[PDB]
Write an enzyme that holds these catalytic residues in place. Structure first.
Site, mmCIF file in Angstrom:
data_model
loop_
_atom_site.group_PDB
_atom_site.id
_atom_site.type_symbol
_atom_site.label_atom_id
_atom_site.label_comp_id
_atom_site.label_asym_id
_atom_site.label_seq_id
_atom_site.Cartn_x
_atom_site.Cartn_y
_atom_site.Cartn_z
ATOM 1 N N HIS A 1 -5.161 -3.967 4.489
ATOM 2 C CA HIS A 1 -5.032 -2.789 3.646
ATOM 3 C C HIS A 1 -6.229 -2.565 2.754
ATOM 4 C CE1 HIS A 1 -3.057 -5.695 0.728
ATOM 5 N NE2 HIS A 1 -3.717 -4.955 -0.144
ATOM 6 N N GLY B 1 -5.195 -7.016 -7.450
ATOM 7 C CA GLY B 1 -6.471 -7.555 -7.019
ATOM 8 C C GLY B 1 -6.426 -8.956 -6.441
ATOM 9 N N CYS C 1 -4.820 -9.836 -3.710
ATOM 10 C CA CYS C 1 -4.629 -9.911 -2.272
ATOM 11 C C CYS C 1 -5.826 -10.584 -1.644
ATOM 12 C CB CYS C 1 -4.401 -8.518 -1.677
ATOM 13 S SG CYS C 1 -2.732 -8.036 -2.103
HETATM 14 C C1 LIG Z 1 -2.940 -6.798 -3.413
HETATM 15 O O1 LIG Z 1 -3.942 -7.191 -4.335
HETATM 16 C C2 LIG Z 1 -1.620 -6.461 -4.089
HETATM 17 C C3 LIG Z 1 -0.970 -7.664 -4.771
HETATM 18 C C4 LIG Z 1 0.204 -7.298 -5.683
HETATM 19 C C5 LIG Z 1 -0.166 -6.386 -6.855
HETATM 20 C C6 LIG Z 1 0.815 -6.786 -7.939
HETATM 21 N N1 LIG Z 1 1.079 -8.185 -7.633
HETATM 22 C C7 LIG Z 1 0.831 -8.507 -6.365
HETATM 23 O O2 LIG Z 1 1.060 -9.588 -5.823
HETATM 24 N N2 LIG Z 1 -0.722 -5.902 -3.079
HETATM 25 C C8 LIG Z 1 -0.107 -4.722 -3.222
HETATM 26 O O3 LIG Z 1 -0.173 -4.043 -4.247
HETATM 27 C C9 LIG Z 1 0.716 -4.248 -2.032
HETATM 28 C C10 LIG Z 1 -0.180 -3.563 -0.999
HETATM 29 C C11 LIG Z 1 0.540 -3.114 0.267
HETATM 30 C C12 LIG Z 1 -0.345 -2.242 1.136
HETATM 31 C C13 LIG Z 1 1.057 -4.305 1.058
HETATM 32 N N3 LIG Z 1 1.746 -3.304 -2.406
HETATM 33 C C14 LIG Z 1 2.868 -3.628 -3.067
HETATM 34 O O4 LIG Z 1 3.125 -4.740 -3.491
HETATM 35 O O5 LIG Z 1 3.648 -2.526 -3.179
HETATM 36 C C15 LIG Z 1 4.956 -2.587 -3.811
HETATM 37 C C16 LIG Z 1 5.900 -3.480 -3.027
HETATM 38 C C17 LIG Z 1 5.840 -3.326 -1.506
HETATM 39 C C18 LIG Z 1 7.104 -4.054 -1.078
HETATM 40 C C19 LIG Z 1 8.064 -3.776 -2.207
HETATM 41 O O6 LIG Z 1 9.284 -3.933 -2.202
HETATM 42 N N4 LIG Z 1 7.337 -3.206 -3.192
HETATM 43 C C20 LIG Z 1 7.910 -2.386 -4.248
HETATM 44 C C21 LIG Z 1 8.127 -3.075 -5.575
HETATM 45 C C22 LIG Z 1 9.084 -2.591 -6.457
HETATM 46 C C23 LIG Z 1 9.319 -3.179 -7.705
HETATM 47 C C24 LIG Z 1 8.554 -4.262 -8.022
HETATM 48 C C25 LIG Z 1 7.601 -4.755 -7.158
HETATM 49 C C26 LIG Z 1 7.363 -4.179 -5.940
HETATM 50 O O7 LIG Z 1 6.968 -5.841 -7.767
HETATM 51 C C27 LIG Z 1 7.669 -6.064 -8.926
HETATM 52 F F1 LIG Z 1 6.832 -6.233 -9.955
HETATM 53 F F2 LIG Z 1 8.338 -7.214 -8.827
HETATM 54 O O8 LIG Z 1 8.549 -5.042 -9.182
#
Ligand SMILES: *[C@H](O)[C@H](C[C@@H]1CCNC1=O)NC(=O)[C@H](CC(C)C)NC(=O)OC[C@@H]1CCC(=O)N1Cc1ccc2c(c1)OC(F)(F)O2
Ligand SMILES: *[C@H](O)[C@H](C[C@@H]1CCNC1=O)NC(=O)[C@H](CC(C)C)NC(=O)OC[C@@H]1CCC(=O)N1Cc1ccc2c(c1)OC(F)(F)O2
Lengths: 306, 306
Positions: A43, A148, A150
């Site tokens: 991604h 950041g 990932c």
């Molecule tokens: C990459 O650097 C990053 C790492 C994340 C950012 C915050 N902490 C991390 O570990 N990845 C992403 O942001 C990722 C990219 C996609 C293209 C895979 N997206 C992501 O995490 O999107 C939201 C996530 C996808 C699956 C899911 O159920 N969600 C929704 C969600 C809802 C509520 C949340 C949450 C995620 O995290 C929470 F903080 F726990 O509360």
């Protein structure tokens, strides 16, 4: 009384020397530089307005080598020229002109629920911390990752050989985390798209609870041990109804049984009783069952056996 | 719901490159090689039949440079020739012919109760794991150290500068650990002799409990917050009677107060109530107060502030 158990990570230096920054336009994250290859989450190719449903195949075809910038910051700075790119599952495999001169001996492996591994948390290609986690039964980890992170990597170590088993991708709604193996498959049923995803129910890792109860015995704490026993088959039928993993014995658990003289089946019985309640008592300072330490952790940290 | 908090250590590579094996006859442990100096525990000089009451001054005078063998095993193997030796408190300062070419930028500092630091556990000069601990109010740490770990080092990191704060020396009767600062003083009232030693009573680190309650609020868990308040002065009088450290606020705690909009005094009140019992409720999965996470941990891991 302290048990002698801590969350122990592998020393991280070998892996620190493999981390790089990968940028693809307005997207930046971490990659892992081994030999002439840089692994990173696919991604990185996605613009933000498309993270909710990328067409990764079309994004891939739209890339050129020019599209990727790879930089190493720590120790031996460098800009790595990308000379090939390919996609494997949820990872990109970039080919670069320079082979990493600090490439350790390594393998790629998948980690199983209940097993522990070390994580090197990185931001912008810079290692910032390290911690250890157990793969949960629902294929998440209880990590500590921010925007950041990932591309941060998880690994185990057998001797001098680093077994890379995890590349960080996402955070789930309950605050846990998941990512990819280096075959490109996501752990669990998860997909690398920014959409709420059903996550499976977590469970107690029975083998790790057994290990912790042995740690308690090794520390002189054995009030919960009775001559009563529950067989593995019977415990496993109970586990299915009570949010435990089915127990599978290993040589590491058997070593704990031999050292302590307490049978596995006595601790399976104890788990059944303790699950109903500790009745105001504590085990190694805890009023709840602990499943974040493995049999190998207990053998190594308390008994000095590797 | 996972809090997003883990036991986070610094990446260990910079320090791994400074670890050596030091041997003095039948005694072997770890040392730290910075510039032309190797630091190690002075009981490397002691034969076993004398560990219960060494005369370290006489042992020192009985040494020659020939008496010490220093070896580096990992990464850039070497035998370091000792050309001078001296004793500072409970440490030896060996002078060696070769300056460590991987010496990081560093300082020596002492760590205070409640503050966290990273440990690189080493055996025979070989790094084997890393973990993070908080200095307890009785000047012990809840570590994971076995025979041969003496000389393992603890440190913090400010930017690229490593602040070395701990060199491992001993295990106390309750399974906790202590060692020296690099000025040679043992933490606490302890002495580097193999005799049972009275150890002081441990306490809850109030500032770290406050930090953890803020972490809970940052995760949406705030059932324990009331408009009720206890002043710092009043809480500190309560703490003295109830096995808590006196609370001293810091800018890191103030940042948590601002982000959450919950005053410190509301959490001091909560601590007083929670100490009497959680009444069957949980905070971040725990039924007991947690004091192993610092305000800085919460700011960094949850809020992304360093
Ligand atoms: C990459 O650097 C990053 C790492 C994340 C950012 C915050 N902490 C991390 O570990 N990845 C992403 O942001 C990722 C990219 C996609 C293209 C895979 N997206 C992501 O995490 O999107 C939201 C996530 C996808 C699956 C899911 O159920 N969600 C929704 C969600 C809802 C509520 C949340 C949450 C995620 O995290 C929470 F903080 F726990 O509360
Ligand atoms: C150095 O490699 C080594 C590190 C120890 C070994 C086991 N785990 C460690 O961390 N240090 C020593 O062995 C040390 C050397 C001295 C010269 C300083 N001795 C030591 O720890 O001796 C016993 C200790 C001294 C202070 C004290 O109260 N004791 C007695 C004692 C009694 C019961 C114990 C215990 C220590 O540790 C225990 F396991 F918790 O149970």
């Amino acid at each position: 009384h302290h048990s002698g158990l801590v969350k122990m990570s592998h020393p991280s230096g070998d892996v620190e020397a493999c981390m790089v920054q990968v940028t693809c336009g307005s997207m930046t994250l971490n990659g892992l530089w081994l030999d002439n290859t840089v692994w990173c989450p696919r991604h990185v190719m996605c613009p933000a307005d498309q993270l909710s449903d990328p067409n990764y195949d079309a994004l891939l075809i739209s890339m050129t080598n020019h599209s990727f910038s790879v930089q190493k910051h720590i120790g031996a700075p460098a800009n790595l020229r990308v000379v090939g790119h390919a996609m494997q599952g949820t990872l990109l495999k970039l080919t670069v002109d320079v082979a990493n001169p600090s490439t350790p001996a390594y393998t790629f492996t998948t980690v199983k629920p209940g097993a522990a591994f070390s994580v090197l948390a990185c931001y912008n290609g810079r290692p910032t911390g390290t911690f250890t986690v157990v793969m949960r039964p629902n294929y998440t980890i209880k990590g500590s990752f921010l925007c950041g992170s990932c591309g941060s990597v998880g690994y185990t170590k057998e001797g001098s050989v680093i077994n890379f088993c995890y590349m960080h991708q996402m955070e789930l709604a309950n605050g846990t985390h998941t990512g990819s193996a280096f075959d490109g498959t996501m752990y669990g049923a998860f997909m690398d798209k920014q959409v709420h995803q059903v996550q499976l129910t977590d469970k107690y890792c029975s083998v790790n609870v057994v290990a912790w109860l042995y740690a308690a015995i090794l520390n002189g704490c054995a009030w919960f041990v009775k001559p009563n026993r529950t067989s593995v088959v019977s415990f496993n039928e109970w586990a299915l109804a009570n949010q435990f993993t089915e127990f599978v014995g290993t040589q590491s658990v058997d070593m704990l049984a031999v050292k302590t003289g307490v049978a596995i089946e006595q601790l399976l019985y104890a788990i059944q009783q303790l699950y109903t309640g500790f009745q105001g008592k504590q085990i190694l300072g805890s009023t709840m069952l602990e499943d974040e330490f493995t049999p190998e952790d207990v053998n190594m940290q308390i008994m000095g056996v590797v």
